[PDB]
């Protein structure tokens, strides 16, 4: 029994359906320290991309001996996300929620930067754009 979080859904669905890795856009330039679980998700995506067609068991075997192995095993047996008909739509929905959460963090970062350092022209336009858009169980993530 695990409560849903965005990153639990993404990592769990990917572990249970490694073919979903092909729907993930590039994550290489994201700061994993901004979002718990993002670093592990990125690792899993890259593992799937390096070995197309791998099974859940083969993906889990690749992570044996890592500090995330026990967490990946739990998520692999998580029945709450087991339904295959809705797996892809759920993955895509949660992918967009992840990026929305990063946009909120970026907006908060730019507000704090503006009070401490002022913003560049590019940053001020970025913050304005973000403001307009806004106007309109031991798993550690
Ligand atoms: Zn990493
Ligand atoms: Zn590896
Ligand atoms: Zn949603």
Curated annotation (Swiss-Prot):
Q: What is the effect of changing residue 132 to A?
A: Decreases interaction with DnaB and primase activity
Question: Disulfide pairs?
Answer: none
Membrane-spanning intervals of the chain: none
The record comments on the domains as follows: Contains an N-terminal zinc-binding domain, a central core domain that contains the primase activity, and a C-terminal DnaB-binding domain.
Q: Which protein family is named in the record?
A: Belongs to the DnaG primase family.
Assembly and interaction partners:
Monomer. Interacts with DnaB. The primase-helicase complex is composed of up to three DnaG bound to one DnaB hexamer. Component of the replication restart primosome, which is composed of PriA, PriB, PriC, DnaB, DnaC, DnaG and DnaT.
Q: What does this protein do?
A: RNA polymerase that catalyzes the synthesis of short RNA molecules used as primers for DNA polymerase during DNA replication.
Q: What is this protein called?
A: DNA primase
Species of origin reads Escherichia coli (strain K12)
Corresponding gene?
dnaG
Portion of the full-length sequence here: 445 to 580 of 581
